[PDB]
Amino acid sequence: VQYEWWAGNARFADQSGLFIAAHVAQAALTAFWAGAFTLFEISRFDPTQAMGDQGLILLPHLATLGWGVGDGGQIVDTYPYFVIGSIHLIASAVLGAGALFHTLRAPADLSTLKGQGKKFHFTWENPQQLGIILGHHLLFLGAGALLLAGKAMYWGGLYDATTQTVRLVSQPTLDPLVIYGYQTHFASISSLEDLVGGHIFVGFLLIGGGIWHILVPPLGWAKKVLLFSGEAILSYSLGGIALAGFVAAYFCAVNTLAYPPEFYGPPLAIKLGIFPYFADTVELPMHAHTSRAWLANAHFFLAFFFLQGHLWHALRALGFDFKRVEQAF
Amino acid sequence: YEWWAGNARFADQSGLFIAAHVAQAALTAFWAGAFTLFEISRFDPTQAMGDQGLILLPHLATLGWGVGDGGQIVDTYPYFVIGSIHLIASAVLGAGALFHTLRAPADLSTLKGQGKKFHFTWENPQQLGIILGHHLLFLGAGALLLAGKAMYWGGLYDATTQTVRLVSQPTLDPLVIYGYQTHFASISSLEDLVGGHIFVGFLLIGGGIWHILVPPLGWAKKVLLFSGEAILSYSLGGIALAGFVAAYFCAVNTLAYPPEFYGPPLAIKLGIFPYFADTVELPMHAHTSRAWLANAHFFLAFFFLQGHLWHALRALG
Ligand code: CLA
Ligand code: CLA
Ligand SMILES: CC1=C(/C=C/C(C)=C/C=C/C(C)=C/C=C/C=C(C)/C=C/C=C(C)/C=C/C2=C(C)CCCC2(C)C)C(C)(C)CCC1
Numbered sequence: 001v002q003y004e005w006w007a008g009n010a011r012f013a014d015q016s017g018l019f020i021a022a023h024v025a026q027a028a029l030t031a032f033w034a035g036a037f038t039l040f041e042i043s044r045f046d047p048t049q050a051m052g053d054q055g056l057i058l059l060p061h062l063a064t065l066g067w068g069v070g071d072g073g074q075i076v077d078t079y080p081y082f083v084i085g086s087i088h089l090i091a092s093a094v095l096g097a098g099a100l101f102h103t104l105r106a107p108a109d110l111s112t113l114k115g116q117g118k119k120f121h122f123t124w125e126n127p128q129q130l131g132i133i134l135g136h137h138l139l140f141l142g143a144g145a146l147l148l149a150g151k152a153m154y155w156g157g158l159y160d161a162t163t164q165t166v167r168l169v170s171q172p173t174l175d176p177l178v179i180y181g182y183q184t185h186f187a188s189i190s191s192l193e194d195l196v197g198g199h200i201f202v203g204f205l206l207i208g209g210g211i212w213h214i215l216v217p218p219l220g221w222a223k224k225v226l227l228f229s230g231e232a233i234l235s236y237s238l239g240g241i242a243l244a245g246f247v248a249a250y251f252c253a254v255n256t257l258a259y260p261p262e263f264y265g266p267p268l269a270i271k272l273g274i275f276p277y278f279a280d281t282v283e284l285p286m287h288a289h290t291s292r293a294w295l296a297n298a299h300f301f302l303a304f305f306f307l308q309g310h311l312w313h314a315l316r317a318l319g320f321d322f323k324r325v326e327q328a329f
Numbered sequence: 330y331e332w333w334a335g336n337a338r339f340a341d342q343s344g345l346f347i348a349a350h351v352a353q354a355a356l357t358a359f360w361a362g363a364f365t366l367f368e369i370s371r372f373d374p375t376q377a378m379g380d381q382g383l384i385l386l387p388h389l390a391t392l393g394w395g396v397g398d399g400g401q402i403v404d405t406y407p408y409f410v411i412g413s414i415h416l417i418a419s420a421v422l423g424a425g426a427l428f429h430t431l432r433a434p435a436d437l438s439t440l441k442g443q444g445k446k447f448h449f450t451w452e453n454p455q456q457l458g459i460i461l462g463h464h465l466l467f468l469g470a471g472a473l474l475l476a477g478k479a480m481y482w483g484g485l486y487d488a489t490t491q492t493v494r495l496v497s498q499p500t501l502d503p504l505v506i507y508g509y510q511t512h513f514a515s516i517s518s519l520e521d522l523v524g525g526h527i528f529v530g531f532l533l534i535g536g537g538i539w540h541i542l543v544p545p546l547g548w549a550k551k552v553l554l555f556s557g558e559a560i561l562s563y564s565l566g567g568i569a570l571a572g573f574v575a576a577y578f579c580a581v582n583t584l585a586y587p588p589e590f591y592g593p594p595l596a597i598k599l600g601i602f603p604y605f606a607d608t609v610e611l612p613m614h615a616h617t618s619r620a621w622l623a624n625a626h627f628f629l630a631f632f633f634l635q636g637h638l639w640h641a642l643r644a645l646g
């Protein structure tokens with residue numbers, strides 16, 4: 001088959017080197033937006049005023065971790081933001097280095113190699129090596145969860161918005177029955193110590209899922225209840241990231257504990273006119289909104305559009321290319 | 330190759346390569362010495378050294394030769410003798426350039442004496458490893474020359490107390506040198522500058538001894554391309570990155586060298602094109618020497634990034 005130049009990235013479906021290269025380049029663009037815009041939207045910051053009114057977009061996430069804040073919720077420094085931005089710069093540098101190295105120098109078909117590349121070629125009809133890739137990615141996401149768990153033990157703990165202190169969390173929960181009953185108490189637990197205690201359980205859960213995916217492949221029913229094509233696997237990933245975007249918009253709307261209210265903004269209100277959105281209780285006159293409303297709304301619309309993309313790839317994968325032509329006789 | 334790619338003709342000869350490079354070295358030393366001698370004549374002692382657009386005399390003012398106490402100028406004879414030694418060195422390098430064009434042959438394979446171990450190609454790794462190690466040895470020699478000029482041959486100028494201070498008690502631990510990546514644009518002290526310079530002097534002389542004493546292994550020959558335009562691409566990307574970070578270094582650092590020789594601290598401006606501007610105004614509408622240097626080094630570094638891009642496209646397929 002042939003694809004036009006307006007949409008021609010489907011040629012990454014069989015070529016594996018470009019499949020690695022374009023995605024690592026995309027991650028390089030994400031890390032470049034993380035590093036560059038932190039060091040570029042720093043001149044808009046003023047510690048005399050608040051953080052919710054000026055429209056700071058990146059720096060709320062850095063003050064969430066509890067690096068350069070103390071008693072009362074005030075910012076007296078920039079140097080932790082400087083070192084996190086700088087490690088994001090050099091991480092984007094090395095990640096774009098590997099990206100363009102795979103784009104320009106590495107071969108496209110990984111099965112035509114001689115060293116440790118022919119054992120690295122993937123395709124869309126195996127449950128074993130794709131399960132190995134899923135296991136390694138689950139290991140790395142669980143390692144990020146381990147880093148979130150160690151943030152509450154290494155650098156003085158996370159930031160608390162109730163007690164206005166960067167306190168060290170040293171009380172882990174030794175019971176998963178509280179974790180079962182959290183489905184009513186979503187973003188209403190009124191405790192910052194239970195968030196890390198829920199993070200160690202899901203972190204060890206991610207390690208166990210990665211161990212299960214490395215050790216054993218899909219044992220037979222996933223070949224029947226699921227598909228392995230690129231459009232179908234793209235559909236599953238886009239549905240997962242759309243559910244993540246919707247629950248992140250809900251956490252940016254209602255929580256006001258992990259996100260500090262004096263930095264991000266006030267608790268929001270769920271409204272619906274033409275489209276459903278979130279509005280501040282304290283409006284701003286200069287056609288501006290807080291970081292809460294901006295983040296929650298933008299992640300809601302992006303999660304909706306990626307749910308529509310998931311439905312598009314699901315219709316593309318399951319043979320429904322163009323079958324609504326038979327409406328009119 | 331007809332008159333518009335003319336330097337690429339002797340790229341494969343590798344006998345007049347040496348002549349072109351020592352001619353370029355002669356031109357750089359000529360510009361250095363002759364423009365110190367030029368800017369000595371157009372120098373005002375009463376006015377500040379940045380408002381009249383002076384580059385190399387403030388660059389020698391960091392070394393503390395022709396300056397005193399309070400930001401003033403004691404004399405111009407150290408700048409004069411430094412530019413004079415640079416001019417005589419450019420004369421002998423241009424003499425060596427005319428030597429290597431005329432009396433030296435087009436290829437070093439015709440030579441039969443003791444200089445036959447100087448011929449280099451684009452095929453063997455050990456020769457260019459020896460060249461890289463000797464150049465790293467000379468860079469470490471320049472770093473220990475700065476160490477000697479800082480400790481046992483003179484003092485430095487500090488922007489903190491505004492004097493020429495012979496700096497003792499340098500940085501002696503490798504922890505804070507590892508941590509100076511976090512704050513490199515603001516060194517915030519000159520004792521850390523000289524201590525880290527002795528640290529990187531030891532580091533680069535260790536890399537030089539490691540390079541000449543150990544031949545290349547072979548794990549990078551299958552990854553990196555061993556062509557002339559490829560090594561030109563690697564060095565061009567290195568010097569373009571160094572020029573960009575040196576321009577950003579010049580834009581904000583007001584105490585690696587003191588700012589009374591350059592003017593106000595430069596401010597960034599990011600619009601359709603990035604450029605650095607001052608805060609005060611000058612009646613000539615001429616920007617300060619720091620404002621000339623940082624903007625020119627940023628634009629030359631960006632054009633060198635594009636040149637390394639073009640040479641890396643030409644080196645690949
Ligand atoms: C992880 C996400 C992801 C990935 C990998 C893909 C991958 C793919 N999609 Mg796709 N898609 C996604 C998300 C994704 N999509 C979402 C979220 C939507 C809903 C909005 C769609 C809607 C969609 C359609 C409708 C079609 C595809 C098609 C394709 C395939 C062809 C290559 C391509 O992208 O065309 C590259 C195409 C472009 C770059 C578009 C051309 C330029 C446009 C005009 C600019 C972008 C418009 C936008 C408004 C710009 C502003 C951005 C805004 C955020 C500010 C390719 C396999 C096509 C297909 O099936 O194969 C032919 C196809 O027809 N996708
Ligand atoms: C020190 C760095 C360096 C080195 C050693 C080289 C070396 C080389 N380049 Mg090159 N290049 C560089 C940087 C460098 N380049 C940069 C930064 C760029 C981007 C602008 C380019 C763009 C470039 C192109 C587009 C081409 C080369 C080519 C070549 C090769 C042949 C050169 C020749 O005789 O024709 C080069 C041409 C001339 C010498 C004559 C025209 C040059 C004009 C007169 C210069 C005018 C600029 C002006 C005086 C400076 C203003 C600055 C201001 C401060 C005053 C040679 C190997 C050619 C090649 O690969 O062969 C096919 C080729 O086509 N280069
Ligand atoms: C506690 C806590 C926490 C945690 C959390 C967690 C732990 C979570 C989990 C989560 C989870 C754990 C989830 C789950 C989900 C699930 C789902 C979502 C699924 C889906 C699936 C699918 C979709 C599939 C299906 C199928 C099959 C099976 C076959 C047939 C067909 C189909 C395909 C349909 C936090 C951090 C917040 C903090 C606080 C507290």
Ligand SMILES: CC1=C(/C=C/C(C)=C/C=C/C(C)=C/C=C/C=C(C)/C=C/C=C(C)/C=C/C2=C(C)CCCC2(C)C)C(C)(C)CCC1
Binds near residue numbers: 352359
């Ligand atoms: C190879 C070649 C080339 C190149 C060459 C060159 C360019 C050269 C250079 C050369 C040089 C560049 C030289 C220089 C010289 C100079 C001189 C020789 C000067 C003198 C002076 C001095 C040394 C001193 C100083 C002084 C004093 C001390 C006192 C007062 C007065 C005065 C200031 C004078 C060309 C391109 C052409 C062509 C092709 C080939």
Ligand SMILES: CC1=C(/C=C/C(C)=C/C=C/C(C)=C/C=C/C=C(C)/C=C/C=C(C)/C=C/C2=C(C)CCCC2(C)C)C(C)(C)CCC1
Binds near residue numbers: 093097509552
């Ligand atoms: C801060 C400071 C300092 C220091 C400095 C230093 C110590 C530096 C270092 C630096 C460093 C030490 C650097 C490094 C760099 C490196 C580079 C820049 C690289 C890159 C590369 C790339 C990116 C590529 C990649 C690759 C490879 C590697 C292999 C093959 C493949 C490829 C090509 C891909 C001082 C003392 C002066 C004083 C005070 C301030």
